[PDB]
Amino acid sequence: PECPDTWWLCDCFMATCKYNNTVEIVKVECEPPPMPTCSNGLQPVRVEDPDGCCWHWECDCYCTGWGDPHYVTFDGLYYSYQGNCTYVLVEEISPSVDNFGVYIDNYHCDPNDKVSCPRTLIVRHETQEVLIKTVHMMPMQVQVQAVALPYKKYGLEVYQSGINYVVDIPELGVLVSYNGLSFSVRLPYHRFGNNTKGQCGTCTNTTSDDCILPSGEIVSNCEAAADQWLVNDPSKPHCPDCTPSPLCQLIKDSLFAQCHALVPPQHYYDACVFDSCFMPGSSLECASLQAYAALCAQQNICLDWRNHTHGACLVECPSHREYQACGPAEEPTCKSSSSQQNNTVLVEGCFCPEGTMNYAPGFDVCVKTCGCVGPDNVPREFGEHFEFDCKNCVCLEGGSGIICQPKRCSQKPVTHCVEDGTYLATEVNPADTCCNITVCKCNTS
Amino acid sequence: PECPDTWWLCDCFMATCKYNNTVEIVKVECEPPPMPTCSNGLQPVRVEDPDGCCWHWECDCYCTGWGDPHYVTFDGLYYSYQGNCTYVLVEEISPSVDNFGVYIDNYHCDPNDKVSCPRTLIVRHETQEVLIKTVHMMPMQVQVQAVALPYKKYGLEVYQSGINYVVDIPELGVLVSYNGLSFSVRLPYHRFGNNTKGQCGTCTNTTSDDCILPSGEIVSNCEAAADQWLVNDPSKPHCPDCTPSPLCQLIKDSLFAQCHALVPPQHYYDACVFDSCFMPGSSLECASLQAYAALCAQQNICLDWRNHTHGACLVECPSHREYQACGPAEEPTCKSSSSQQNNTVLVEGCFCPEGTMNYAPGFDVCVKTCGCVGPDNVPREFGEHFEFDCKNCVCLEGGSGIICQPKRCSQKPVTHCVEDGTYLATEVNPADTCCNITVCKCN
Ligand SMILES: *[C@@H]1O[C@H](CO)[C@@H](O[C@@H]2O[C@H](CO)[C@@H](O[C@@H]3O[C@H](CO[C@H]4O[C@H](CO)[C@@H](O)[C@H](O)[C@@H]4O)[C@@H](O)[C@H](O[C@H]4O[C@H](CO)[C@@H](O)[C@H](O)[C@@H]4O)[C@@H]3O)[C@H](O)[C@H]2NC(C)=O)[C@H](O)[C@H]1NC(C)=O
Ligand SMILES: *[C@@H]1O[C@H](CO)[C@@H](O[C@@H]2O[C@H](CO)[C@@H](O[C@@H]3O[C@H](CO[C@H]4O[C@H](CO)[C@@H](O)[C@H](O)[C@@H]4O)[C@@H](O)[C@H](O[C@H]4O[C@H](CO)[C@@H](O)[C@H](O)[C@@H]4O)[C@@H]3O)[C@H](O)[C@H]2NC(C)=O)[C@H](O)[C@H]1NC(C)=O
Ligand SMILES: *[C@@H]1O[C@H](CO)[C@@H](O)[C@H](O)[C@H]1NC(C)=O
Ligand SMILES: *[C@@H]1O[C@H](CO)[C@@H](O)[C@H](O)[C@H]1NC(C)=O
Ligand SMILES: *[C@@H]1O[C@H](CO)[C@@H](O)[C@H](O)[C@H]1NC(C)=O
Ligand SMILES: *[C@@H]1O[C@H](CO)[C@@H](O)[C@H](O)[C@H]1NC(C)=O
Ligand SMILES: *[C@@H]1O[C@H](CO)[C@@H](O)[C@H](O)[C@H]1NC(C)=O
Ligand SMILES: *[C@@H]1O[C@H](CO)[C@@H](O)[C@H](O)[C@H]1NC(C)=O
Ligand SMILES: *[C@@H]1O[C@H](CO)[C@@H](O)[C@H](O)[C@H]1NC(C)=O
Ligand SMILES: *[C@@H]1O[C@H](CO)[C@@H](O)[C@H](O)[C@H]1NC(C)=O
Ligand SMILES: [Ca+2]
Ligand SMILES: [Ca+2]
C-alpha cells in the first residue's frame, strides 16, 4: 500500500500510495513573488529549488569599488577607505574552493597616483593567479608570466568586455571585472552566501554585518575594519572653498532620470563631490559617473553620458574603433559567431564601426568580409594569394586560415667567375630579401 | 474522477483515474532482445522511443564501395559495376532535406584505377557542395573553391580521421568517408528509412528491395540497374591466367580470425580475386583488405594488415608522422584537448609519436608540450621571443598566441663621413635584413 521503491515521484508528483496500481497523487508547485529588496538594490535572480517545480528568489552578491578610496560592499553599504598595501577584497570564511581570493593592491605597485598603476587586481583560484595591473592606457595580465586577453585554463577564463577586463569562474559562477578606475565582484548567493569575507563584506542580504574583521566579529566603524584586511607580503612588509563642479551635477541631472529609480544616486554624487574636493582639475572626478552608468547598464538601462560631460574625460582606444555608449557585452566576432546566450545587457565601450566587424577573439582588426587575418593584423580574403613572412601563402577557408607553403626561390650564383676575384656575392634580392642572389662579382683582389 | 490532465504519467508511468488524487498507477518499461541479424550484418544501434518508456534496435544504413567497380548496398548486397561518368550514390525518394545527395564520379578525377586517383565524390547538402578529389597521394577538397581540412559551414563539417576524409551532417546524422580507394556512407534508419535511392539501394533492412531504377522499380540485377542512375549536368554533357595470389589469401588466413565472425568475408575475398584477375601485379587487391579491416574496426576487431602484407600496401605521410594501425579517430590535439569524446573504436592511420601530439586542428606539427605554431609550421614555446616577418613577436598563452609588434628598428645613422668618396649609405642591416641602417659606405 505504501509504495515499494507515500513517496515523492518524478516531475514533482508526490504521491500518497493507496496501492501499487492505484494511488492518491499530489501535484507540487511553488511561485514566489520577486524578492522585494536585495539590500544592494540590484534585481533578484530566480534560483531554482532542488525540486524542479519550486523555485525562489535569491540576491546576487555585488561589490563595487571606484576611484581611489570608494567601495560598496556586497550588501550596498558604502564606505571610503584609502590605503597602500594589497588589501583583500573577498575570501571564503569556510573554505570550499582551494584558494579563492580576489585581492586589490591599490598604489602598492606605486605610491604616486597615475594611470601607470591606480591599482592591480589579483584573482587567485586553485593553482592559478591572475594579476591585471593597468600599465598606463592598457592593462596587461600576468598569470603566475604574461598572457593574452582571451585566456582560458583550468576552468578560469579571462576576456575583455566593453571597457571591463573580465575574469570569471563558470563552475563557481564568479565574475570579476576590472576597469582603469573601477572593480566589480559578482557572486551567486547560493554558492557563496554567508560564506564570504574581506573588504567587500559578508553577503547575507542585510547591511548590518557587512564589516567583519579577519577575526570575524563585526564593528560599527566599517572604515576601520577595512584596514584589518591587509594581505601581508614580503615587499613593504610594514604595509602601514571646494566648488561642486558642474560635472558632479550630472548625477542629479535629468540625464540620469531613469537611473534615479532602481539605483540610489546619493553615494555616487557624494563620491564625485569628495573626489572633486580631493584636488580640483585632475580628471579624477568623473570616475563615479562611469560606475553609476555601469550599474545603470547592469539594470538593463543604457545611457550616453560622456558627450554630456563637455569632455575632460573620454575613452582612449585606437582609430579603427568608435566609442559606443550602448553595445554588446561580447562583440560579434566573425570567426566565433554563435548563440553566446546573450545577456543583452548593453555595455559601453568602443567597438568596430557599423559596416565592419571584429575578426576573432584575440584579434583587433575590424573587417567587412570575414576572411582570415595573420600574426600581422592585416585583413586577408578567402582565396587571396599573398606572400606573408618569406613564404608564399594562401588564405583558404577551413581549419587553418593560411597554408603558408615555403617560398620557391634561391640565391643565384655565376659559375664562370672569369673576372679578377669574381666571387659569388649573396646580395639580398630587393623583390625577395630571403630569395637573394650569389652571382660571381669582381672584388679588388 | 476523470483525470483533469487516466493518463500516461511522467517518467513513463501510466495511470487510469477514479479521482485526480485517487489514480490507478501503471509503469511501462521493457528490453527487447537485439535485432539478431540485419541484412548489413552490422550491430544495430539503440534508438530511443519518442517517450521514455522503452527503445528498440535499428541497424544503421551502411554503404561501402572499394576499388574501381565494387559496391555493397545499404543491405549487404555486393555487386561490381563499371562506369565512366558521375553516378548517384544516395538521394531521397521523397525530398525532406533540400538538395541532399551524395554523388560518385568515376574516371573523371583522372581515368585511373590505382590509389593515386581512383575517383571523386560530390556531397551536396542545401547550398553547399563538397567535391573531394584526390590527386596522387594527396586528396584535396573543393567547396562550391578549395578549402582547408577542418572545414565547417552551415551545419556541414569536413575533417579527416585516420586515412579517411569525413564529410558529416550532425543534424542529419549523415556520415561520408572518402579514402582514395574506398568510400562509406552511413545513414540513421529513422531519419532515412525506405526513403533512400541510388547505387547504394534502399535501406529497408532487406537485400531484396535494395535495387531500384530511378523510377520506382525492383530489378534483381543490381549491377544492371546501377547504370540507370547517372546524373548528367553541363559538366561532361556528352557522357553516355589469373593467379590466386596469396595476398588475397590473406583474407582467409588466421590473421582475420576475429573478422570471419560478425563480418562475412566472402564478398571481400571474391572482390580481391576479381581485382587480381582484372590485371595481376598492380596491387589493386589491397583495396579489399583495406576495407575488410576498416569494417572490422567498425565492429571493434581492429587488426594490422599492412605489416603482413609483406610490403605490398603501406601508408604514406611525412617523417614527423608514424603509422599506428589502431589509434584514435579524433587525434588528441593540444588545442582543444577537451577529452574529446567520440566513439572509442580505433581507426588506422598515421599519427604523431607517442611522446608528442598534434598541435591544433588544421595543423600538422607534432608539438611536444604545447606552444603556439605560426603560419610557418614552426613549434613555439610559451613566453618565447622570436623575430618573424620582420616584426618582434612573442608566443604567450591566450588568444592569437603569436602577438607580433612592428620592427621598431632604431637604425642609428653613420652620416658625417670622411674617406675618398664616402657617401651616406642606408644599406640593409646585416644584423637585421628588415633594418637598412645608414653605415655611410665609401666609393
Ligand atoms: C533579506 O531578505 C530579503 C531579500 O533576500 C529582504 O526581505 C524581504 O522583504 C521584506 C523586506 O522589506 C521582508 O519584510 C517584510 O516587509 C514588508 C514591508 O511592507 C511595507 O511596505 C509596503 C510598501 O508597499 C507596504 O504595503 C506594507 O504595508 C509595509 O508598510 C512587510 O509588510 C512584511 O510584513 C508582513 O510579512 C511579515 C513576514 O511574513 C509578517 O511577519 C508581517 O505580519 C506581515 O504579514 C515584512 O515585514 C520580507 O519578510 C522578506 N521576504 C522574504 C521572503 O524573506 C530583505 O532585503 C532582507 N532582510 C529581511 C528583512 O528579510
Ligand atoms: C532485419 O533485421 C531483422 C532483425 O535482426 C531480421 O529479421 C528477423 O531476424 C531473424 C534472425 O535471422 C530473421 O531470421 C529468422 O527469424 C525467425 C524468427 O522466428 C521466431 O521469432 C518470431 C518473432 O520475431 C516468432 O514469431 C516466431 O514464432 C519465432 O519464435 C526464426 O524462426 C528463423 O529461424 C529459421 O532460420 C534460421 C536461420 O536463419 C535457422 O537456423 C532456424 O532453424 C530456422 O530455420 C530465422 O532466424 C528473420 O528475418 C526475422 N525474425 C525475427 C527474429 O523477427 C532480418 O534478418 C533483417 N533483414 C531482413 C531481411 O528483414
Ligand atoms: C548564514 O547567514 C545568516 C544571515 O542570513 C547568519 O546569521 C549565519 O551566521 C550564517 N551562517 C553561516 C553558515 O555562516
Ligand atoms: C553627443 O551628445 C549627445 C547628447 O547631448 C549624444 O546623444 C550623442 O550621442 C553624442 N555624440 C557623441 C558621442 O559624439
Ligand atoms: C545572440 O544574438 C545573436 C545575433 O546577434 C543570435 O544569433 C544568438 O542566437 C543570440 N543568442 C542568445 C541566446 O542570446
Ligand atoms: C633594404 O632592405 C630590404 C629588405 O632586406 C632589401 O630588399 C633592400 O634591397 C634594402 N635596400 C634598400 C635601401 O632598399
Ligand atoms: C640567400 O641568403 C641566405 C643568407 O642570408 C642564404 O642562406 C640563402 O641560401 C640564400 N639563397 C636564397 C634563398 O636566396
Ligand atoms: C516504407 O514501408 C512502409 C511499410 O513498412 C510503407 O507504408 C511506406 O510507404 C514505405 N515508404 C517508402 C517510400 O518506401
Ligand atoms: C610484422 O611482420 C611479421 C611478418 O609480416 C609478422 O610475423 C609479425 O607478426 C608482424 N607484427 C606486427 C603485427 O606488427
Ligand atoms: C576518439 O576515440 C579515441 C579512440 O580511443 C579515444 O582516444 C577518444 O574517445 C577520442 N580521441 C581523442 C583523445 O580525442
Ligand atoms: Ca551582509
Ligand atoms: Ca533494402
Numbering used by the authors:
A (entry chain B): 4350 to 4354, 4375 to 4513, 4518 to 4613, 4637 to 4841
B (entry chain A): 4350 to 4354, 4375 to 4513, 4518 to 4613, 4637 to 4839
From the publication, what sentences describe this entry?
The MUC2 mucin polymer is the main building unit of the intestinal mucus layers separating intestinal microbiota from the host epithelium. A low-resolution image of the MUC2-C closely related MUC5B C-terminal has been published, but currently no high-resolution information is available for the mucins or VWF.
The N-glycans were of di- to tetra-antennary type with a tendency for having the larger N-glycans found on the VWCN and VWD4 domains and the less complex ones on the MUC2-C tail.
